[model samples]
Target: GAEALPLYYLQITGITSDGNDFAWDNLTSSQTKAPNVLKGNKLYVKARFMGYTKLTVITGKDGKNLLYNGTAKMFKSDAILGQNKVVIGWDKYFEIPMDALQDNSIQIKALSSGTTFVYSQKIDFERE
Candidate 1:
């Protein structure tokens, strides 16, 4: 088996960070922002607008990566198990990282299409 960096992390795992909310309705339009952040508050991108299954934010700060502001319930099929694996899931969006880092980044690794994909964004969060 190869290294498959887990694409769809439980949306609950991303709820630690908070901030100005942006929507990724379309990258070209949504990426346009005023660079507002936490302190203020954390930075958030509404991933619900994308067709991805999960999300991850990378940062070089002392703290951890997190997501917040939205949620949805999804399920998986199990033929052998007889019952559908119903899981109350959430995968909305994530934070860009705090302290304004050099490694501040975000990536979308899974799409509903069952194909692996990623959107690695390199963001240099300029702080005051």
Candidate 2:
């Protein structure tokens, strides 16, 4: 007999000064053993843009959550067909132990402080 795979939920959340905090939970595959867990993993976020926008990763410097001064690109596509479905994609691969849980996280925000967008997932992985 074969058992259905379990689905794990990854939640992404953040807050800014002038912009609203974005949050969402994503359902995806989970790695509970070796071999399959060592390969690679992907985290995806679905979003839309009204004008020209960008995504960046934010980090902490000197123990403080670094501001929006960082400029980075997560993923981009011109536009979608018909209904304009924009999918912000991110992926990562790493090493982790078989008996422990791993956490891979990233911070992505709008280029401008005035306008804000939401991200649904942050990706992480581990290998052994």
Candidate 3:
């Protein structure tokens, strides 16, 4: 018999010009609505996982390019012997450009391990 693992949590945080932070959760249906992002604003992403996986962040619907792509690994010792929790995060400040947004909307696609785990959401833009 095979057992399934629990779903991990994903959070996206946006920093405003005044140094304020807002977080959006992917697990909640109501909270999944797009958050407003301003041009030149910085974005941070945090997620939890159990094993090695690939992360890809894509912008736009018909775009082939990726905004951010990388791989992450979780130590077996930490999972089997330790806390059994792995938190992955990236905070290099992904800057948004005015041209990338279309119709006052920004579409972001985050895929992990093919189509098994994915986060696709649209973020509204508050233009300056």
Candidate 4:
């Protein structure tokens, strides 16, 4: 019999400076009522999987790529095989350039041995 891979899910959350947070599913677009974000706001993502994974961020407009950045590598251990998470902008905020805001959206990509997922959100920008 062929081995079965465990099911996995991803969640994305954004936190504002005032301490408000919103979450969205990895398979769906974010639905924050006021999806405006500043350069210094924090972003946290959680995923469930049993193998190695890589995460990245890209920003752009109308199908053009702009800023591209992300973590190098993330791994899951047998003991904690079902849950993995990472935080961006905890110690340092995302370095999105002010000019990049003209693009109007950001993208997140997650890759594992057997799967590749992407999440995107439209955004409004504010000066920090």
Candidate 5:
């Protein structure tokens, strides 16, 4: 049944806050190419940036006022320009229960050493 579902992805480019810019993307849904349905599951996040220093991912929680920053294993700096990624799976997934989440709404904020930016996205999943 999951195979029939459509995949969803959110992409943000030229992200600027207080005059800073970068590339960001988020996938709120599972890959339709896979046979699994990601109900009651956590989000596996991957982030990338270019020509900067430091990166952070913030998930809004506790009345949408607080944020939860994730911890992940660090990798050796890559030769590619502004490339950084973090995957949350078994031990890294951010479990967001369906009922607890607001329909079509997820708040995210990002911060670098010198700048900060905030954004929100909408997600819709029909009952399976």
Candidate 6:
């Protein structure tokens, strides 16, 4: 068993009440969890995949709706992804649909062969 291609980072970015530009990251163990966002505001998802590939950054939870989304990539050559020693990242963002449940948790995943990487976070809506 070789090293796993870890999900290096996943983030949610948007306009927020505290600040116009808000950014939040996925939590690992022993870390602070999710944040509350204002309802009706747009939210975007972004992920960075670091270390190796056989990968596809595919769909995951959007508060209970299905989404066929995200930009998947193929690092076809060793030269393409920093000489096979490091890196792949989908820097583009997806605006989570307005109809999506703002109080539920969110998850995004990537898979290939028998490998799966899931990044999840709970995002609530600040409400009346």
Winning candidate number (TM-score)? 3
Q: What lDDT tens digits, residue by residue, belong to model 2 across residues 47-106?
A: 333333333333423322233332222433443232444333223111212222224333
Identify the candidate with maximal lDDT: 6
Per-residue lDDT for 1-128 in model 5, tens only? 32221212222221111111211133424321212233333332332332232333434433442223232223333333213442211111222333344442333334423444433233333322
Tens-digit lDDT string for candidate 4 (37-120): 544433322333333333444443333333232321222222242234421111112333334333433333444335555443
For model 3, the local distance difference test gives: 0.37
Model 1 lDDT, residue 118, Cα = 48
Cα shift from native, residue 68, model 2 (Å): 12
- 13-119 per-residue lDDT for model 6 (tens digits): 32232232544444344233344543443544443444444343434344222343432223122221445753454344445543443334444444433555544
Off by over 4 Å in 2: 1-51, 58-78, 84-103, 111-120
Candidate 4 deviates by what RMSD? 8.3
Instruction: State each model's CA lDDT, in order.
Output: 0.34, 0.29, 0.37, 0.34, 0.29, 0.40
* Candidate 1 structure, TM-score to reference: 0.34
Record all residue pairs in model 1 with backbone atoms less than 3 Å apart, i.e. clashing.
Answer: 14-67, 18-42, 19-42, 38-41, 38-42
* TM-score of model 5 (CA atoms): 0.33
The ten-residue window of minimal lDDT in model 4 covers 86-95
Instruction: Tell me the spans in candidate 4 whose CA falls farther than 4 Å from its real position.
Output: 1-12, 15-30, 33-52, 59-93, 112-115, 124-128
Superposed Cα deviation of residue 87, candidate 1 (Å): 18
Judged by TM-score relative to the true structure, which candidate is superior, 3 or 6?
Answer: 3
Better candidate by TM-score, 4 or 6: 6
Give the TM-score of each candidate: 0.34, 0.28, 0.44, 0.37, 0.33, 0.43
Q: What's model 1's overall lDDT?
A: 0.34
On residues 14-66, what C-alpha lDDT tens digit does candidate 1 reach at each position? 22234323322233333422243323235454443222244444323333332
Model 6 poorest 10 in a row by lDDT: 71-80
lDDT value, residue 70 of candidate 4: 33
Candidate 1 vs candidate 3: which has greater TM-score?
3
In terms of lDDT, model 2 sits at 0.29
